[PDB]
Amino acid sequence: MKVILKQDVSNLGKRFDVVDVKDGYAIHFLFPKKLAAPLTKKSLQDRDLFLKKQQEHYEINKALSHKLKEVIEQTELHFSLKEHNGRPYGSIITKQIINQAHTKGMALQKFMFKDNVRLGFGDHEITLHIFEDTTAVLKVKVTPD
Amino acid sequence: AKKDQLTLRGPLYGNNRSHSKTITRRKWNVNLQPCKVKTADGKTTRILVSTRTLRTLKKHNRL
RNA sequence: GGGUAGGUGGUAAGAACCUCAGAUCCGGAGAUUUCCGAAUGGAGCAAUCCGGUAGUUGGAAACAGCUAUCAUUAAUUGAUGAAUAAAUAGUCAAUUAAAGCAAUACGUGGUGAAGUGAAACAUCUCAGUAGCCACAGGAAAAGAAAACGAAUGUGAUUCCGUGUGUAGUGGCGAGCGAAAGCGGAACAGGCCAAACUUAUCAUUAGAUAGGGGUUGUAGGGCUUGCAAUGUGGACUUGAAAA
RNA sequence: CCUGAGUAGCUCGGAAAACGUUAUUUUGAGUGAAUCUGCCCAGACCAUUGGGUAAGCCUAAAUACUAAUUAGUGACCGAUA
RNA sequence: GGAGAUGGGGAGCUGUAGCGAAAGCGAGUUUUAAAAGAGCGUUUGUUUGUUAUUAUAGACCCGAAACGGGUUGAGCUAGUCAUGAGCAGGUUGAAGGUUGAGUAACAUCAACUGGAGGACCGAACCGACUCUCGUUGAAACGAUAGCGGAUGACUUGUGAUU
RNA sequence: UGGACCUAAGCUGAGGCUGAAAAGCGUAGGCGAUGGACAACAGGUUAAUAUUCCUGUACUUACAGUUAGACUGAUGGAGUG
RNA sequence: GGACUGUUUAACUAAAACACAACUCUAUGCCAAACCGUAAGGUGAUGUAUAUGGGGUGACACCUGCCCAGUGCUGGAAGGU
RNA sequence: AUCAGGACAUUAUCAUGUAGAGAAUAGGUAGGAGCAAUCGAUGCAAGUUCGCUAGGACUUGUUGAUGCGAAAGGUGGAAUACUACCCUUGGUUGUGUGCUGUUCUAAUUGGUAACUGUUAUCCAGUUUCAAGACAGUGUUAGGUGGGCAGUUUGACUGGGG
RNA sequence: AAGGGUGCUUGACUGUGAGACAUACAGGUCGAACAGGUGAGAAAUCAGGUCAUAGUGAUCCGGUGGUCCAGUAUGGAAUGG
């Protein structure tokens, strides 16, 4: 349990400060977007330490989000299909897109994804709410057998 | 066994009564829930845990 | 080493003979110990059958002897690394432990019966015993006041006797049965966090080590000076006497 | 400035303590603190007084026994014992 | 202190004052308004060797069907599974099919094939229905003699099986 | 006849899931014939053994060399049994 | 009387008994329902209502008559507890 | 986690309801006979409302100055105008909690499938699908519950019952 | 008459009780007499339920009134007496 929020203007939009509705293991602490911090020192020492942490994470996290958004918008992803009769038979799952992201060398969190499955016939691309400000399209090249 | 692996906290086999003062052997089984535990650098490795130990983990920011 | 005139474990009948280069005999230190057997190469219906690797002598070889070696787990180390890059899971190699037995006597804990006694019996007793399970160690266990307790009372546990068969609780039935104060036996108290500090950890400290500390006549730390070369030790070694 | 957190207490079920659950120990389920001007005990609770510093760890000695070598000892038994 | 009497050892008693539930008072105390009355109390004390009774312990000795805790036995007489074997001999000859007559066609009629049956009689191979036999026997369950099934839900070896 | 080969009923159990300890179950591996596979018969032999002892006739598979051909066949796959 | 082959009380009793084929009820849409335990797990079944589980009678044919006032079960949740 | 209805709270909030009475919502006790007037027209048209239909009027962009005849006479089971509180019927309110019904998943479950460890019908990890804060549970407490444990099951008696 | 009706009336008292009868224990039955204050009666005196006998259930346990009982150190309270 904690009162700390982190890096979100969505999810019952509020200020970038310390605030949390006290209810067990709810989404207020189920997400990596709200850090469980020790409230025993969250008065003056953890206070200014968390202020510094908030400013630092603010800066570095939007920096990395701009970097990854540029990477996504400048790179297109590739699969290979295995159908029969040549008629549309396959689709696109999020597991394989996460695996291709892993191929580049980062473990992207699922919290930027809202879809579950995509149609894999022909060219297909979707722009998702990756982050509060950075938006990019997951350009993927897919063709049948 | 029927115990969380985080500590050896065994169950009870005690005496149960009714509105006759008769004694029988009853098996006090503690609460168990297989919640996902967190450790250093991922590797959650879900294990069966007890509710009291769950709350103690919660109060130490260890999930 | 002692001891030495006989000896080949008892049914000794005798052949063969050993024995005074000091034996046979009584102790210390040893060596080699077949197979099963906790059993460990794997099986197995115990005292059995097939094995693999490594080295070995013989041959042209299958093969034969001749040695050593090959369970499982946990821990450490290293290597390797699946789903899907790292990661993680596994996969292997080397190293340390028991893994097992018994003293029907002992002790802890996890357990855990009724028939009886109450003249029956369900509450209580039968008793935390009967039996079972794990851990042992030669003693175990507990062990240092949030004790007691009613007074300027003691001051880590234990047992014996006394309280006393009292205080008591008990379908107030059968019953069960203490805690204090007293005499005595030996009676050592220590240690880690923890503020705070240095170096080292990737300071998203959430890690090694120098301190520092065990505290109720509250202590310790923090800032700052005198001392003092102490006494104790349950405790590391060697040497000597007994 | 530090004095030992699901920790003390509290509620619903039990046991040990002589007690048949009551002060004191145990949590089986839950709720949950106070930090020396404090926090717990003196068979309920408070006020006064007094006594302690729990929620960290070890230490044996007075005691339990004899399957095990000699010293031996028996108002122990004598081959149905 | 010899596996000894004994010495040391001043803890608790058993009476010495008792009444009243206790507070409490006291040669008195309590019910009591009560000094009255009434109930009780007005000094025989200790520790042992002993005989008889007694509570507690197995309690004068021996005599039940028991209850619980284990531990063991599926080999036979029960079922199950796996895996084999056995059924001499003679009968009864279903259905299906074939051939001719017929049927618009199928159904029907006669003949051929056919071998079917928890089919029949009766060998073995299992069972025990009966008069006797023996009721310490040859035999802790059978013998003569007659009785049933007898290609099945049958018998049955060898493994496990609860 | 079996083991050195397989496996039915089951057993065991590296793994691993449940249970207070005991233990229960369950994968791979590994076991377990009454069955699956095949290459010796005849006669004689001494009191006892005879396809095993002997006379003649055979077959079997493991390897070295040897000629003379062929490129090869699994832990994997289909049939067979 | 039982329909029938047949089966079991061995060492006092195989019959009118049990099995039946044939019906009537009744619970079941999969992790079935039920069954074994402490659970895992397993049968049911590597099955799907034309299937299993459990009742009553028991070939074949004809009939199965009247009663939810009392208990078992189903619907309700309006009303009281 | 999300709200719709949603009951207690009815924070605030503006009118209050023609009792024998009262011209009219005296709803009750009270200093009681004014400057309540930057808490002020007697037309609009009325939202309503008391609805015993007028009545009370809280009601308003063309009106900036109405005045109270209802205060002393009149009615009474209580007097009409500057202050305090009372059955203030409810439009309302912050929502604290409880009832459902739906909207999702990240909690949590699977005995749907694939891949891997592994040639291994169990598990391990993920991804779908199935579901989903219900259940599966663990605790408390009710209802049913001879399947199961123990039990008492009086005596006398021209024998026992 | 200890029977009928009359005024008053609640001694259908308080604390007792030497004593007897009966009797295993229990418990039962009756009563002299003392103190206190009473009603009837002028007084003598009487009145400690009924002319007599059946009109009864033990302890423990549970709380109701008073209480010159105590109050796990003190103070009360709880709590028991």
Technique used to solve these coordinates: cryo-EM
> What single letter denotes the amino acid at residue A143?
T
> A11-18 — which CB contacts under 8 Å span 24+ positions?
A16/A54, A16/A58, A18/A42, A18/A50
> Encoding tokens for residue A97?
């897109």
Do residues B9 and B30 make contact, with C-beta atoms less than 8 angstroms apart?
Answer: yes
The pair phi, psi for residue A28, each rounded to 5°, is: -60, -35
What is the structure's resolution, reported in angstroms to one decimal?
Answer: 5.3
Please check whether strand D approaches the CB of B26 to within 7 Å.
Answer: no
Segments of A10-66 assigned E as strands: none
Cα dihedral sign, A14-A15-A19-A24: positive
CB-contacted nucleotides of strand H (7 Å)? 1-2, 106-109, 124-129, 136-140
**Local structure of A49: helix, strand or coil:** helix
Residue A94, nucleotide of least CA–C1' distance: H127
User: With contacts defined as CB-CB under 8 Å, which chain B residues touch A2?
Assistant: 61
Domain extents for chain B?
1-63
Could you please state the CATH topology (level 3) that the domain comprising A68-144 is classified under: Ribosomal Protein L9; domain 2 (3.10.430)
Length of chain B: 63
**How far apart are alpha carbons B29 and B26 in whole angstroms?**
9
Q: Which residues contact B40 (CB under 8 A, 6 or more apart)?
A: none
**Local structure of A141: helix, strand or coil:** strand
**How far apart are alpha carbons A142 and A121 in whole angstroms?**
7
The nearest CA of chain B is from the CA of A61 a distance in Å of 20
Q: Where are the alpha helices (DSSP H) in A80-139?
A: 94-104
Segments of A36-132 assigned E as strands: 77-78, 91-93, 117-119, 127-128
Query: Which residue has 């409230």 as its token pair?
Result: A39
**How far apart are alpha carbons A32 and A57 in whole angstroms?**
13
